[model samples]
Structures are given as C-alpha cells and as structure tokens.
Target: GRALAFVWLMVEGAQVAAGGVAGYVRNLLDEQDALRDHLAERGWSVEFVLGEPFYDPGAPGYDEERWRRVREHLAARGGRAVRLVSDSDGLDGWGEERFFHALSATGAQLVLDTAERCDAVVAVSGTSAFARVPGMVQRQGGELAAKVLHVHTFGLATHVPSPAEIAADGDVAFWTRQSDRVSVGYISRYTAELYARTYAIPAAALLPNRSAIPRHAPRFGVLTEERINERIAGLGLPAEGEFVVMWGRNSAPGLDKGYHLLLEAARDLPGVVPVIATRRPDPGLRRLADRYAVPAVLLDDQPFTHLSALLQSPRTLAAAFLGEAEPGAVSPMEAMWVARESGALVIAADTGNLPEVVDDGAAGIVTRRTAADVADAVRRVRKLTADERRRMRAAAAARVRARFDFAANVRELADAAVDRLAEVS
Candidate 1:
C-alpha cells in the first residue's frame, strides 16, 4: 500500500509541551481511525518519525573537536559580544545561520532516509523543522523528488527569517518554495499571505490564503473538584476570586503577544493584584505584582493544573485577557473552553479570531488596543448584577464546537496531499 510519513522534531522522550507543534500532530494521530478509513479507500498507510532538532555531539555529520570549540567560544562570551552569523564570509565564527543549517541539513538527511519508505514526506513546521526537506528530496532524483511536499504551518509571523539570512547553505526557510521538483502548501491563510510576500511566491497562490488551524486534544486538563481544591491548597491561593487580575503565557519572542497590554490593563482594573505565572518574570510585571504576596504558582510547578483550579474555584475571579498578534491563536478558544463551565468574563482584543470566542462579546468584552477598553470591560464585569453575571456566564458556558472541524480538516489534508503528488509533474 502507498504510505506517508509526517516528520516531527522532538526533544527525545519528552511529552508534547503545551502549544507545541507536536500537539497539532498528536491531533492528527488521534484522528487516525478516520484518516485510516479514508486512506484505506485509497489504498494507503501512515507512520510518524521523530528526529532531534539539534545535532548530537557525535552525530553522523558533526566533527567532535569543531563542535566542542564552538560551544566553548559561545560560553566564554563577555558582557557584550558581536552577533554570530553563519551566512558571513568566515567559517570559524558561530552564527544562527550556521546552527540552523546544521539542524535542517541533519533533518533533511533523516527525511531522505525516511522518504524511501513513504510515498509522500511531510515536513511538519515551516521554518524550523521543514526548511530543508523539499530540496533534500528533490536532490534524490526522480522518484523521491516528486514525492516531496513541504508544508508551511504555524508560527507564520514569528518564525519568518530576515532576507539577509537566506544564504543558499545557511538559512533555507526561503528556499523551500523555490523547488519546482517539490509541492508546497501553507497551513493557514495568515501564514500563506506572509510567506508568499516574504518568500516571493506567486501572488495568485495566496489568493485564498488557505489555512488549517490544527488543534488536538485540550492542552489544559481539568481534574476532579477534590483534586482541584487540594491543588489550590498546595499552591497556597486565596479564597477571594478577585485577588488577582490573572494572566500567564509560556513564552514567545517579542511583545506581539501583548504581555504589555496585560500589565497595562491590570493597573486600572477592578483590582491591582496580578496573579501571573511564567518561568522568567518581567521586572515591570514583578514590580506591579508587589501589591500582594505572590502565589506559589507564580514561578512554580504544575501550571496547567493550577490554572484549572483557579478558574474552577467559586471565590476565584477568573477574568482572562486575550490579546495576541497571531490572528488564529488557540489561546482565546482554549481559554474560553476552560472558562466555559465556570463563567469567567474574558476581556478579548478586537483582533480577528478573538471576538469569536466571546461569541461577539456576549461572553465577554471585545474592544480595541487601548487599556481604557480593557479596564471598562473589567469594570462592567465587577458591577454586573447577579442575574446579569449569570446570563453572561451561561453564554460563555455554551462552547463553540463548530469553529474548526478537526475530522474534516484532517480529511482535507489527506486529499490535499494526494493532489500535491501531481504538482511535481
């Protein structure tokens, strides 16, 4: 039977992190029953391959002494150091270009090895995991060349490389679209528009800006009420729900995710306590959070569980802020999912895809970038009468399950993969 492989770069034996690409792939894996049934009709099978995103010290292509020297050089850097560029004229200095080149080259070789088995090879993420698969497959000559399909998925805006970084051997993110021997499809309409202009792909190809938002099983797990309250006790949280203007995120490059907006909005809201959680706390945010002693979850463990406990608590004021640069972010939807049963009024940015979670502000407030709008949303929630609050909460309780049909999306992806096979002709 014809076979396909979806390649992922993993941290070796680690569980899929929240918001990671692997989570999306995990969803596709869970949809295997449907995927298998559909593909069986077409005579096909599937497999998934995980490879290291970084090279091992003694990996096939790496030189032992050279790798050691490079690590030492980086570690010995002083308070100030010049930028490293793998695209530069020198062969000695370490640049991000050189590092990513090693990463993709290693990944491409893995794909080439795997492609011998798969009728089609899918390079899952665009820049990080997928930069070299198309070219590597194309280099394998006719049979394998035509078998390549590199997908541009997730991190559209954040993952884009600078034009200067696109050296032929260094950064290959921009080169994947250039290979006529391979087929290319973007995961999101937002990503398509960005990649088309950035990589100089044909404008017509981005007309519809096709996007597929892949969300697997819920990232946040809701535990037993007893476990939740017990977890709350472990976190040393307060009974007063309004104790914090809560906001938290794992990490993302730049402020585009609206970390500042969260802090700014928290200042003039119903209360001044900031119940935030992250590995590295920002100085400004830390200062603002000085109003009250921080909760154990501020820089502690079991974050997902703790958030679930806080949202579920009767006394916990669960007003969440949703402001991120990505138009099709999963946070708004997931946050709405978590708060659905408990009834937290979210103050969402009027940005695309956010208001949809609030069901056009029925569940919460949808407003502009200004803190005034956010503060007013909080103000309204604070002053909400018992009946009014219940009405809004009930609206939130009605989850929007029809937003992105995972099963339909997976089927479309399979058919699209088959269509892509003909493009290399």
Candidate 2:
C-alpha cells in the first residue's frame, strides 16, 4: 500500500490524433514523471496502467516516438504493460463490453494485479474496468483490498451498470460494494453538478478543468502582420481583409460538436472564413461552405500543428465550443489564450462550461447559442475598430494572467484522495 496506479485502457490513440479526453490523458502523462519524483519523496510510487502495444514497427500505423514514450513509462514505473480490452469501439476492434471482458478474460490477470502492486487506484478512462474488478475478484473466491478513485468523465455515462444487474444503493455504493474505499472526483464543476444531482452524491471534489492543460507561449506575437499573412497563406488558407473561424473536434473526433447551427450562421457573414481540423472528413462542413459559397479550409486528421498560426494569424475568431452536449470541457481554453495573445475575438454557444471558457478573464466579448445571434456577434467582431481590438487585448492579457496561472491542482487533489484512503486505518 505504498504506490499509485493510473488505469487507462485505450491509450493506443492518445497521441496518434488526440482529441480532448486523450489530451487530458496526454497532459497527465506529461506530468507523470515529475509527479513520480514528488510522490516518491512522499514515500509513494506511481505507475501507469495502460493497454499493450498493437502497432507494428514496420507498418503504416507505426509511431516510433509514441512507442519510445511507452517503453520509458513502464521502464520507470513498477506496473505491467499487458494488453487491455477496448473500453469503447477501439483500434482493437472490441466494443464497449471489452472493458468488462478485461476482468473476466485472459486480460484479467494484469487488470487485477495492480490491486496488490499499488497502494491506491485512480481510474482515468476506465470506469467499468475498475468498477467491476472488485466483484470480479470476489467471484474468484478472493477479494481485492484496495482503494479506487474514479475521475469523472463521459466514459462513466454508459458503464455505471443498471439496477437490473446492480442495485440502487445510492450514489457511491451503487458503483461498488467497496464504496467506502471508492472515491469520485469530477473534472469540472459542471460535470460534478450533473453527476451529483443525478447520482445524488454528498459532494464531489473540485479539480477544475480550467488549468488542465498548461498555457504555451503565443506564436502570433513575435511575427509581423505581413509575415503572419505570408505564413498562413502558405498553409493553404486565406489572408488579409478576412478573419478565420475554426471548428475542431471534441474528445471523440469525427463526431459532431453541434456545428450545424453555428456554421449556418456563417452563410451571410462577409470576410469570415472557416478552418476545420477534424479526425475524419466532414461532408457537412464542406457542403455547408459550398452551399453558402463561403471559402473554407478543412484539415482533417491533422491537429496541433498550424493551430496557433491559424488562431493568431491575426484573422482571429472562435474555434468555438458550440457543442449541444453537456459534457466536461477544457479544450477550448488553450485557444482562448491564443485568441488573447493573438488579439482575436471568440464566439461560443451558451452551452456546457464553454461560456466560462469563452468568457474567462473576459476573453471573448459575447456568446450565444442561436445561429442568428452568433451571426450578429461575428459581424461585431469583424466590425471592431483598431483601438477597440487593442483595448480588448490589453484587458484580456490581465485577465488570463490573473486567472490562468497553474496552481498544482491535480497533484493536490490526488494527494488529498490518497490521504483520505490512508486515514481510514
């Protein structure tokens, strides 16, 4: 009981073309090593429990860098790198039930081993995997004496078993018979409330999604306006006299982020171009742009690169979080920083925690859900005078610096959870 293990089953694609949740996992991995040292100093060891590699080195699916990171991750941590079943439709070709199979199939051995190998268990993307493990151990005529903490994510939505198979024993107990040892921490206040009201938990921890991903130095501030135009133009996008609006994918790409209404508002907006970066092709975006006869750029399967340039190409606008889903979100905060540094304006649907992200530090001017209202907002951004944009930029820098500073929230939250477990005797 002196180690910590982070259970994430489907990290095979965490880096290949990472969306938001994968971004969350990837962000955690970035801090794992530093955390390992910190926890080690506190007399604790940290481990990452993930799926086995499935890519061939000589194949088109090969990712040399990702493989290198994986090797280093396991080499340092005292955790197994066994094959894990896909929690959802995965590259392993397994469906959602694959998570359940992890504890019942040949994969069960590694899934259960972490119980004794680690002091506390933190379920990152595996709700069913960890939730069912204690019971799985019981059926084998033994029990796992461990503490499990499930970090709330959308993955828990479908996996938290129904009453037909499980009983309604109230919030935490409903997830596991070892409810006393099981803890839940929400990623955002929004999801915490949603899950708390639905599950009726006493209270959930506050691990705000605000600073989930650290802010990077701006790419726009250094370059000249003319040079910025030249570089962006080289990337097969538009130039001066026109600003671009982007629509990137959410945690699960190739899925809709409630873009239909937002894009529809763009038909009449002059000088506004659309830049899309998706995991898969979206005919809806292309067809809409074509129907509207507005120029648009779609960069599918290519994320990360060109993002800053596009945001700060000085033709700044929202990669707006227009999603209709009430999901936990922090992916847009990065763009808002670039928007602030880039001296750009943002438009967001008045949905999710998106408004908070959009409005944080008073970054973006206005947000609305309706296409008509958003259309007017777009015009407002387009019509802003030089002094107005500059004044907004000055105000934004102050707000972001005051609010966006990283405060080690993740480490403290996990530490507190582990502390709670150790306090139980």
Candidate 3:
C-alpha cells in the first residue's frame, strides 16, 4: 500500500483569532480529512504532520491572544491522525540553522526518513515547510521515489512575490512549472493567471485551490430569536434586524477590507446601523466611530453562537466589503454563505476572488470600494420590495449552493491528489 505525508505550518490553531494563514491551515485539515477517507477506500494510508510551532514574542508583530489560544486549542484538540513535532524549546532568537535543526530533529526528519515509503509529500500554503526537500532528496542520490506538491494559497494581484521571494534557497523549481515531478496548486484562477504571466507557471499545471463555502446550521443551539434579540438589545442599539453587518479586521493594514469607508457611510444611512465584528478594536476605529457620529456596535468579543445569530438575523443585509488589497479573504465568503442561505443579499467589492465567490454579482452585489458606491448599493438593496428581496435571496442561495458544495470540492481535491500520485508512479 502506498502512503503519503502532508506537511503544514500551524502558526496558530483553528477556532482562534489569527490571520488568514490559520484559516488556510484549517481548510487544509478539512481537505486532509476528506482525502484520508477517500484514500482509505482505495487501501492507501495518509499521515498528517504539523511543523513545530514558534513565534517571536518580542517582535512588534506578535499576537499574544492568538498565541495563547493555540496552546490551549492544541492541548484539547491533539490526536493521532495529526501530531505536532515537539521542538524549538527556548530558542526564540536562534539562527536559521538552529531552528532548522530543531524542526528536522522532529517531524521534518521523520518525513525524510519515510521518503522512500511515502508516495508524495504535499506542502500546504507555502515553501517554508518544504524548504529542505530538494537537499534531502539529493542526499538520497535521486533514489527517493516520493514526488513533491505545493499548494500555494497566496499570490493575487499586488500580492505575487518576485521569483527570489517565493523560491527556497534559490530553488525556483519549488514554485515554477519547470519540473515534471513537482506540482503547484493555486487557490484562485485570478491568482493562477498572474503567476502564469509573471512567474512563468504553466497554465496547464496550475490547479485551482479547492474551497467550499460552508453552509449554516439551522439554529444556534436552542437560542431563539427572542433570546438573540434580548442579547443584542442590551447593546442599546436599534432593533435586532435593523443593521448592516460589516465584518473584518479593523486596523490600518485592514483598511482595504473597507472598514473606514463603510463606517463613515453607515452614519448617513438612516435606519440602518453598522455592526462591525472585529478581533481587535483599535483606537483608530473608535475615533472613526466618533467622527461619523454613528452609534456603531463594535462587537469584539462574543461566542460563536451569538455571532451566528447576528449574521443570520433577518435584519442583517450581509453587505460585506473587500478592498483591492484583500488577497482573497474567506470572511466575505462565509458571510455570503450565511446571508444568501437566509435569503439576504451580500454586497462585495468587485476585486480579488470576491466577485468570483459571489459569482460576478449573481449571488450578490459587486460594488466599488468607496463610501458613495457602498452606500448607494445598500440603499438599492434596501429599496427592494418584499417579493423582490425574497426572490433575490433565493437566487443567491441557489447559486452559492450549486457552486460551493463542500463535499464536491473536497472530492475534487482528493481526485487531484490521486491523479498526481498515479502519474508519478
């Protein structure tokens, strides 16, 4: 029976407040789960390995909350199918070689040790996890039989890095289409096209990143509309359903997520309050709230249940916005999934893979990233009659379900992996 090992970098555990990369890790886990079941039916075994976790505590970019959450999440979620390599203890400021040694002493070395048995080593998200692959295989004198595949989840417009930036130890074969044994997968067609034109990736070899827009559960565990209404009413805002939920990280770097413009526009929109769900409520966001004179409810902390109620509420327009700088965010897609399922309209920026997820405005509205444009788009949707809104919502939900079925996309990825493995053999 052939076997495969998946290498992934878990910067922070899922269900924690981390960046987009953590979300990618979770997505990979789901894909892994799907593949394991599929491969088991075919008598092949799959092993998932997580690289050693390390974060520079003293760095200005450190996230204390995410870091702590991961430690706790791991303790609770640890299991046999996936294991974390225990290393990198007390070596925060160590040189690259020391760090590499620490990682290699654990799972990295384990992967190479099993290189002959493993049919292929799949690297998720980036190259750091697979940086030593070329050297390890070379040391085996090209006798190692496992092929290598990289699933590049980043690289949209303005996000594509130079050849030097993406290459590992100047090995362009890690990302380029120059090698037959190495395969590269992208998350979006737009991202794939840019790499093909800019970095010379083969148009044929670039596989689309398999993703599924998750479906919403019917209710949040015995939480009724009345209860949710009472909970939200304590916030001292408008009625439960009388708001437009604009969610994303609210900060200078996330300004492109359309936080500033939307907050400003919400001020003048009569009868529609703006509710922002952010992890960090920076002082700048508070100042923006004060400047607009809008009684914006910045929901920084809430259980997943309450958050679901807020998004699924009848009043939420699910009018999410993403600026050009967003390199294909999953938040908007999540919002659209919930909103459309509830027969509500989703407004997204006509940028990145946003329009692609929303089906070029077929599932929702695509607007420019400006206060005037967003405000106008919201008004147009709000002006829809009861029948029109119902029809539009139904259409959006149907389209989303058809395009982003979870099981279907998972099967697609599993098939791709199987095909790659067979081709190598």
Candidate 4:
C-alpha cells in the first residue's frame, strides 16, 4: 500500500468560523500544508475527505462564497489528495439510523477506492456522522488501515449509555467501538481527561487538542492606550474607571449566566459598573440592569464583534465573568483569551475545563455556579490592589503565550501524528 493518510471532515460544514473549533480546523489544515514538503520527502502523503454539499449548487443551503473558500484552500496546497463523496445522501438535517448508515456505506466505498494507497484514516470532528466508517474500513480493509480520531468538542456528562440498543453492548458500546480502533485527540488535556473518565477510555488513546490562539491577537498590542479608549467609548461605555463584562447566552432553560450575580455585585461596589452582551432580548436582564442602573447592551446580532471590541479595550476593562450552567462549553476559553489580551481577570465557574484553564486562581478566579459565589468573586476582583492586579494580568498573558502559541502547538500536533503513523507502520 502507498503511504498516504486520508483526513475526513464529514459532519459540520467545512467553512471555518473566525474563532472556536472551526477556526482551529482551519489552522490545522494550514500547518499540515506547511509541512507537506517534509512529509512527502518521508514517503507520506495526505488527503482531505470533505462533504459533497459544500460544492453542489443544487444541494440544500448552498453558498457560493463558502464553496470558494474551501476550494481556494484546497487548490493552494496544490498537491496530495482531495476526495469528495457523492451528494446522493447528504448530512444536512437530523439524521436517522438509515441516514447515518447510508453515509457510512458511502464512506466505506471511498475508503475502499483509496484503500491500496491509504495508510491511515484521520477524522476531524468525527462525532456521530463518521463514527462507523473507521470500523467499517478496518473490518473490510484490515489492520493496515490505521485510524485516528480528532475530537474538537463533545458532551460527556449528558451522555447515557444505552444498554439495550441494537449493538452488542448498546449505543455506548457502538460509540466506544469507534474509539477502539483509533487514537483519539482532544482540544485540551482537561477535556481529554474528563472524556476518559466519563467513557472509561484509556489515557494513552487520547491526543492533545493542540489548538492555537487566534492569529490576529498579537496585532492588538499595537493599538495605543488612547486608541483602545476610543473604541471603548464608542461602545457606549465609560472610557475610564472600573467595570466587569460577562459573556454567554442571554436566556436559556438553565441558570441566567450569573448575570443577576454581577448586577447584585455592582450594586454593592459603589462605583463599579456591569456591562452585558446577549444574543437575544432578555426582559429579566433588561429589568435587572435598570434596577441596578448599569449599562446593559443587548446585541441581537454581531455578538462576537461586540465582545471582541469590549475585551480588547485599553485599561477600562477590569474583569470578565463567565457562568456555565453546565459542564460542557467553549466560552470559557474564548473569555480567557479576551482576558489575557485585555489584561483583565477571568472570574469563571469551576465547571468542566474552566478550573483547568484558569489554573485554580493562578491565572484567574474560580467560583461555584451560584449567585452568592459569583458575587463574592466579583467583589474580590474589585478589591485587588494595583500591584496585585498587574501581577495577575502578567501571569494570564504569559500562560496564553506559552500554552497557546500557533506554531509551537501545531508542531506538537504534527509531531504526534507523525509518531502515531510511524508506530503503527
């Protein structure tokens, strides 16, 4: 067999978002392409298996610009493999058993077509859509087919092992079986460990997520203090004095993102102000803001834009509050980056990876997901001395620089992939 590795992203659309996991996928592809010359010289080639809907104009929810981005990226690489599955059975809406089974059958066919040249199968965001394909490939194609699973994000606590399903051990068995044949990679050590404990997966089977910080963050350093103040003023916020920003959904089924806590905290701390940005209108939030007499900005659209502007401000921004009603979420990391770049402290709940990322008050403060706890954390941040706040800011920035550098972490992932492939070979 030829030494070629097949990379697949089947579920979510391939168009990468400006941040979060989708952005990480975009960075991964670039890093892989950068090392293409090195990999080819060593007798290893790679190909990406993209969903077909992205290209087909007749397909549901097709966008020309999105297709152009994927095409241009693939074309710029110029060499290696780019395989596209048929559009007959697309993964657009909620998929039934047959929907997924048909998708798997198509994946199996693609694998068989390149089975002779394919050395390993790599799946990015390989959740439910492409889970069965690896087992299919190994069974039909054999152990020569090395499989690696890249998990961007998953909900572990919400998972229930269905014991009486169609498979031998159940749905849990079915999902675990997919991981059995492949090495799994998670976005953070915290997420990987949580997943292992939740699913009974071995530590060795998981790989570090190795995602990098946004590429444009360092450029923000160039903005003058005056410039940052100008931006903050444009947001209808005070250019000076102390204020805290809290981020997340405006209203949901669960607790209210600790908004009430921050509002209450603002009342106690005389001059401190509370600013908010929510996706939709929350009457309760508006009423609370009026009651507390703080500036509450409700952004129905461009929430990210508003958030980036608020967090990137000069010295006016003091701390960022993140309240997680559940364990699995991506906002904590996003909020942390903002805090690091803006020289603000992160007051977050001790849920999921929040504690791991915050490093137990070393980088920022950790609070229980309650009004009183969040209020206490806010008050503590408000009371910090100038020297103490500076120290915390320096530490937060240093951690992000060390652990989240683009080239450094991407190299870590590249090295891991090379080692895994070599070991199996």
Candidate 5:
C-alpha cells in the first residue's frame, strides 16, 4: 500500500445494488492482497464506512447484502474497519443537512472526491438507453466537485463533452484508468480547445493514468463471481462465443449499446447469448429480450454462488455494451479479469473511456459502436482456435498484471489522496 490513506463513504443502500461498481470495490479488496499485506510500503491504512439501510426500498428491488459484502471485504483490507453511517430521510429536506453533519463527524478527510449532487441537470433527449449520458455526466460532475483534496476517475465514467469540452469548461480532470488510445484521443480534442481559452495550465496537460481493474476488486469481486454464474445458468448454457452482459439502469439505444440493439443482436447471434443484469428488470426488458427468448436477471436474485461458479469456468467471458458516450460503466475491465481467469475475450465499442480500458488492441478488442461491428465480433469469437484462446488467456492475465492489478491501483489512488489532502489543508 504505497499510497495515501482514504476513507470512502459509498451509499450502498438500495439505489445501486448490482453491477461492476460494487463488484469493482469488492475486487479491490480481494485481488490486491499484497498491497494491504504490507501497509508500511505505502505508510497509510485505508478504511471504509458503509452507510446503510442497505438500499432505498423506495427506489426499486435490489440486494441489500451486496453492499454489506463490499463493506466487509474493504474492512478486511489492511485490518481496515467498517462503521455503519445512519440517518433518517428528511421528511422534506431538513433532515438531509443533519445526515451530512452526521457523516462529517465520521473523521474522514474526504469522501471519494465526488460532489454528491444528483440533481444538477434537469433534462436531455434520447431513447431510454441514450438518455443516461446527460444524467451520468451530471452525477460525475457532482462526484468530482467534493471535499476531497484530489480525485482520480477510474475511467469508469465514459460520458462527457470530450476533453475539448472539458477544456472549454476549464476544469481539471484526471482518469486513473485509461489506455494509450483513449488518453491520446482525448488529448487531441483537449489541445484544440487550449487555443482560445486562457486556461490555468496553458498547455493541454490532461494525461490519463492507466489503472488496473484490480483496484476495484475489494469493492466488487464477491458479487461478480456470484452474478456471472447465476446469469449463465438462468439462460441454460454451455454458452458459446463470449457471453455479453449489459448493466445500465435505464433503456437508451437503438443503433448501438442500446437495449433494443443488444436484444436484436442477441437474437441474431448464433453462439453469443446476451444477458442483461439490472436492478430494475422492468416489463420493457422482459418485452424486449423475452421475445428473443433471452432472459434479464435482476440483481437481487443474483445468486453470488452461481455467478462466481460461472466466472470461474474456463470458457466464460463478461462484457458491457455501454455505448460510445456512456458513463461510469466498469464492465470492460471487470470482464478483463474474467477473461484472464477463464480465457475469455472482452469486446467493447470504441467510445468514451472504453478505448482507455481495452487499451486499443492490447487488453481486448475495441470495435466501432455499431451493430455490424458487434455482430462481427460475435462471429469472430467462433474463429478462435484453442491455441488463440490460450494465448489470449495469458495476454488477458498479463494485461491485468500490467494495468489492473488492485495493489497497483490502490497505491495510485492512495498517493493521489495523500497529495491532495496536503495541498488542500
């Protein structure tokens, strides 16, 4: 743990119970054992406080247990401890301030560098799949603008106005996870915007710090293994090709990364069966995928035992179809681990931070965000000989080794946190 100490206060109660965020957090705890084993290496201890009532029953159906698992795993890291942050939902808005005060009393220097504001934007237009972007950006903006001295974007948030737009807005940003292509791509856009604006740093200095998916393991691993297996068996599979999984909360697409596009693609895919893991497995999802005879699994019924078993299998591959400009989707790197362990390959649309995660051709395949490209990827999956999958397995493991290993990511995040706290204080 060569990084600074951090106390992350993630609200795990029912709002978001499933998917890679929680999985990523848990994975950080599990895979990066060495990092925590030698805390003297980093000179600090990381701790976590889980704010509970596990979920917002008012929101939708989800797992209260997954968040607890994430908390427990994190606490186990570095002899770290966990505390339950509690509060009453303000009948109107008065209680909200009291909640923050209670949270402030917890002795954390900062919360995961997020603004904590969810209601910044009022609107956007698109199909359900596309609509998530604006809302996501607003959330990320809030997440970035908080009490923390420094911030590191996991490259998890893929939605944005681009580096050019960020430059225009004159904001300082850093992504701890990204590939050379993604960093280079955004740098190009940002440099263009550098000309007119008398920005703080005259040159475009927004370089991405490549991050390993392992950093997220402590937050997410237990459930990923659980959900991944539950999903495959629910559909009945000696599943062929790489199984693609989408995890957005709402509907958004028609052409690419959209639910309908994925649904139609799944129907057409001979070897690939698409399964959507969501908190809200609404009637719409049923209407869409049931027609294809594919099933969408709710996160709560997500049998961790079954999911883990499936991911542990040698033939498993996990992926997220997060569109060109989706935000905070962690599937590619999450899939990277599964691919490495199971000899699976991860395919993604070359949009937003995806190129950053897949690292162009290095870690996995980065294709155009179109149905044809997706279909071709599925077809290409069949062409892989055992030798190729074996090579890929090694490559995938090395990719995680070089980039996503949690120990490295935790150290990076810890260092960033320490530096930021010093500067701010």
Candidate 6:
C-alpha cells in the first residue's frame, strides 16, 4: 500500500473584537481566494478543512448568534470538509490532540487554524490555551512532524508571541508582511507637512496635502468586500439595492469631533434607514438604532467589504469628524469614494478627514451635526436626478479603484509571508 500525503494550514485564535483580528481574517480569506485561483491554474484539487474554538463562558456583549453566523460562513465555505470543534476545557493537551487528530483524519491537504482555532490550543489571549499545544503535540506522537502548517495572522508582534517563540525553538517557519506601525508624529507633523508642500497644500488647510496621501500608502481600511456582500446576502438585499449608509467610530483614536452624538439627531428621518457600520455593540447603540428602526453592523460580527454596494445604495452619508489632531480617518475615505460614485449625497462632519474626501464640494455636502443637517442631507440625496446619480456612481467607483482595493494590498502580506517562510524552511 502507498502512503497518503496532505498539507495543513492553521490560523491561531484571537479576541474577535473590532480591530486587528477581523481585518486579519479578511486578509486571510483574501489570501485563500488568491491561493485558490493560483492552485486552480496548476490543476490541484486543494480542499480545505477549517476548525475554530468558541468556548468563552458566556461573557457579556459576546453575541453568540452573531459569532455563530461567522462560524456558519466558515463551515459553508469548508462544507462537510469543515468541522466546528468546541473544547470546553480547551486544549488540555489530550483534548487538543484529539481535536487536531480528528481534523487531520479529514485528510485535508492544508489545515488552516485561523484566529478562532488558535484559542483551542493556546492561551494566546493569556488564557490557558497555550499550555495545551505542547502536550497535544506530544500526544500526536510525531504525527505533526510530516504535516500541519501554522500561520499567524497580523504582524509578528500581534497575535500570540508564543507561536513565533515556538517556531524559533522548533525550527518551524513564520510568515507575514505587514509594515510596522508608524508613530502619529511621523504621519501628521512630518509626513503631512512634506505632503502639503509637494501637493501645493490646497488653499483649504483642512484638506490633506498630496504628500499626505503617501506615494505608496499602506492598506489601512479594515472592511472586507466579502463581509459586506455577506451582509447584503443575509439581509436579503439585492446586489444592486437602495438604502442609506451611515458610518461613525467614536472610539477610534483621532477622529473625536463629537460626530457620534449627532447620530441621535438622524433617528427620525422618514423612509430613511440608517446603516451604522462599526465593531462596538451595546445597549446604547441598540436603542439608538432601534429608534431609527434600522440596523447597526459591528465590524467583528461581519466582514468589511462594501464601498461599491454602499456607494450604489440610494442614499449614503458619513461623519468623518473625530477627536484630537489625527489628520484623517479611513471610514470617510471609504464613504466618500462610494458617495462620489453613486452621485449620492455624502453629508460629512466639517472636520478631520471628511474635509479631505469631500473638500472640493464636487462629491457631496459637508455639514455639522444637527437634526436639520441630517434632514437636509437626506432630502438632497433623494433629489439627485437619475443622470446625476449615474455620474456620482462612476466617480465613486473610479476613486475606489484608484485607492482601497484589498485584493491588491493583500499581496504585500503574501510576499512578506512567503519570504519569511522560505528563509526559515
């Protein structure tokens, strides 16, 4: 009899908060998408078996319904080939090995542990998870030697440092390509000034100078197109549908312009449903959204790809104002690009990055927070004639194509990971 051979890729687990892990997951899927296409070109079957751990002991604000939705997506994508493994004790060496062995038995060429599964075996989040991995390997009795690939999401400093430590101790490979985070000083005072001088700093000081755009800007937006599409599918909305788009992140470090408070003012607008995209879910937001009788989407609960669909919606408005002196923000960049394309009106807060995107006044209107402002913007969005809307749609699409395409940016991550893996392997 001949021996069977397979490859496995693993993604470790992390807190499903609104920040890094969600974005990391999107990029991981992006890589998988690209890999699928690449492998198809070579005529490889390339089946996938995914596993995630979801045993958080019923913490407050951890909506299991939403979390299960995410898992459902993974299973749908992985099919029966995918197993949703839950370890109440979570990787007590023996338990960890049992789960890992069951996954191995699936005979998947590559087993991707993803951010969820990492928790099953290690306390990467400082829980008891890490204590489980070594023993699990011990129980496997060297089965891991010939198979099982572990890849960490985010940069080396992010995710569990233990994985890298293990890679070092065991001579395993680590892969990633994210750039180190630049300090606020480097971006605003230094980077922005150089950019201002080069781009002739628009007469409007509020606008970002050309240099501020960074000749090769890093991919900073956290939303993924797949997630946005998923939302649309779940909501039973059409690929091309009409709706209102609203975006605000009160907690994000620099954009503190009191815009979040303004969201309350728009609650009563007629025939206008506000869609708030964020990762924070709480009673306050829920009540606010309920008043409007609409929905607020947390980033962690859903993937973040929607510039196109959002722009194409009937009406779109965003408040780009934020606290402090952070020159710009990312959400407005996404909203403006879509609003401009949809010829739909973009009502932005009159501060921070919002000014940069809608500065020329060509794309849409800029207004401060007020009930009147919200009503006026909603009216204006409705008034855009069919032809005007078409023109705006074109602009939005072009802007996004020029900037913010995750498919293109993910290459930086892939190349970085490939190089590192090759070096150590």
Clashing pairs in 3: 241-315
lDDT of 5 by residue, 203-232 (tens): 222232234455343333434444555545
lDDT of 1 by residue, 1-425 (tens): 37766555332211212234435544544565676677768776655555534333343334445334333432342101112222333332223545556555666666666677677775543443345545555665466545666554443324455542445323334444465433335544445556666666654222221233333345445455676578778665554436333555544664454545555666676444345655466565555445433322244334665666666655545455545545455545555556545535566777645665576778767767776666566666778887876777666655334444456666766677655555543
Model 3 misplaced regions, further than 4 Å: 4-34, 40-43, 53-108, 119-141, 145-175, 211-223, 253-255, 282-295, 340-344, 398-407
TM-score of 1: 0.66
How big is the positional error of residue 150 in model 5, measured in Å on the Cα after superposition?
A: 4.3
| Candidate 3 structure, TM-score to reference | 0.75
Task: Give the higher-lDDT candidate: 2 or 3.
Answer: 3
> Local error of candidate 4 at 391, Å?
2.5
lDDT of each: 0.51, 0.54, 0.57, 0.55, 0.43, 0.37
RMSD after Cα superposition, model 5: 10.8
As a whole number from 0 to 100, the lDDT of residue 23 in candidate 1 is: 50
**Alpha-carbon runs more than 4 Å astray in model 4:** 1-6, 13-21, 37-61, 78-94, 111-115, 143-157, 160-180, 210-212, 217-222, 238-241, 254-256, 292-305, 315-317, 325-330, 334-343
lDDT of 6 at 79: 25
Instruction: Tally clashing residue pairs in candidate 4.
Output: 2
Candidates in order: C-alpha RMSD to true structure: 9.6, 5.4, 5.5, 4.3, 10.8, 13.7
Please give the lDDT score at residue 89 for candidate 6.
43
Better candidate by lDDT, 1 or 5: 1
Which number leads on lDDT? 3
Error of 3 at 326 (Å): 1.9
TM-score for model 6? 0.39
Q: Arrange candidates by TM-score, highest first: which order?
A: 4, 3, 2, 1, 5, 6
Best by TM-score: 4
